[PDB]
Structure 1
Amino acid sequence: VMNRLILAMDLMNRDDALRVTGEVREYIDTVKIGYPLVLSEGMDIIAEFRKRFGCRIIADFKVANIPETNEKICRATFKAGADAIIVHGFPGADSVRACLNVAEEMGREVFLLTEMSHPGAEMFIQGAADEIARMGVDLGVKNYVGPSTRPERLSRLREIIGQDSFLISPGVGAQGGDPGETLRFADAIIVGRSIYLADNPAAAAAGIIESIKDL
């Protein structure tokens, strides 16, 4: 992705989301849109963004339902124009395969979320994350999401998926993660509040990229 930086656009009203994305567009080319924005303004916001900014859109829906429902959610998400969707691995392989089947039918991609970045991820997810990552490899998943807040876990994830897999990582900035350290293992970093709540989002994005370039 451009500058290895993905904007997590979690503002909830269209005017603010459009203003901030437009202000930082010169520094990125991939925007992650999730339920805060889609449930507030509608799924049409995906195609509007894609067209307006000519960026790739990753739908952060972190799908975690039964196979049949996950299928329907993936189909609606790609029909809406998303280039990829993030899917939880903890519900198991059949739930993940349902998403991979729809992505294969629609020419899109699935990102598998393995371990989450917040504190509560240590309770149940962390203990299963290595096995969720290995399930991903066994299913042929090539795109993964791991935590910037725990670089030792991000390193172990990278170890399991290999160097050819693509790995993006949230938790940089607000949650405590560091851009440079995270980029030792991930291919791109996801950044939301550090940029979109900043007084000058473009300056915040530029400052992050400056540290990245130095790597």
Structure 2
Amino acid sequence: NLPLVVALDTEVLKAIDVAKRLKGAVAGFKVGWDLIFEGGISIVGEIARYGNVIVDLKIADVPHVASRVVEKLVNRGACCVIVHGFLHPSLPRGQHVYVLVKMTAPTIYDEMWEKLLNSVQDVRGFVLPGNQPEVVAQARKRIGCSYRIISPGIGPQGGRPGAAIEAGADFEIVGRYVLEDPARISQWAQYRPTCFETP
């Protein structure tokens, strides 16, 4: 069980083939825009047959909509969901929620993220940019092993495989790099999550 969550940013047929292939070998799968666009919400439970599914639609709506979206997903196959921390204090929380507080691309988070880690508690964990290992290390210093950290941005976005884990992350989120060649998951073989054994 490599400390890797594979981002299935691809068509349904390809995603199912990849999931079946990597079943039991990775920590889970991230299902997002591309899959839901093609297959509707029913694709979540389908991928969930093969491992833990994190649904990532970057949830960022007001409470009456966000709460419904979260509940539809977690009750139809998702182990957890990613939501935007910028919504704070109007933020979904609890054990099914990962909160994104800084991104692999420049955004207004770049000035907010440390304050957000101070503000946000009682969630599953945080998403922090794995192409900025210093950010992961600082965050882990601040929160210790209280919450999970998962980190995208490995490969095309600049991050080296394992470098976010080295810096303190529990799992790295990897899309194109792995989709292009699923055998690359072996590059995570020597790594273990910093704090939590499961995402």
What CA distance in whole angstroms lies between the structure 1 residues aligned with 2:83 and 2:190? 30
Tell me what 2:101 maps to: 114
SS in 1 for 2:7: strand
What are structure 1's unaligned runs of at least 5 residues? none
On the 8 A contact 1:24/1:205 being kept in 2, the answer is no
Tell me what 2:75 maps to: 79
SS in 1 for 2:99: strand
**Shift of residue 211 of structure 1?**
4.7
Tell me what 1:210 maps to: 189
Percent identical among aligned pairs is 27
Tell me which amino acid in the other structure corresponds to 2:184: A
**Shift of residue 40 of structure 1?**
1.5
**Shift of residue 160 of structure 1?**
2.3
Tell me what 1:88 maps to: 84
**Shift of residue 135 of structure 1?**
1.3
Relative to structure 1, the CA distance from residue 63 to residue 25 in structure 2 (aligned partners, 3 Å threshold; closer, same or farther) is: same
Q: Deviations over 1:75-96 (max 9, x none)?
A: 22123221101010012212x1
Relative to structure 1, the CA distance from residue 152 to residue 29 in structure 2 (aligned partners, 3 Å threshold; closer, same or farther) is: closer
On the 8 A contact 1:179/1:212 being kept in 2, the answer is no
Tell me what 2:56 maps to: 60
Decide which structure has the larger Cα Rg and report it.
Answer: 1
**Shift of residue 26 of structure 1?**
4.1
1:1-215 to 2 correspondences below 5 Å: 2-11=1-10, 13-51=11-49, 53=50, 55-94=51-90, 96=91, 99-100=92-93, 109-118=96-105, 120-121=106-107, 124-137=108-121, 140-184=122-166, 185-198=168-181, 201=182, 203-206=183-186, 208-212=187-191
Please give the TM-score of this superposition, normalised by the length of structure 1.
0.83
Tell me which amino acid in the other structure corresponds to 2:104: S
What are structure 2's unaligned runs of at least 5 residues? 195-199
Alignment coverage as a number of residue pairs? 192
What CA distance in whole angstroms lies between the structure 2 residues aligned with 1:75 and 1:142? 15
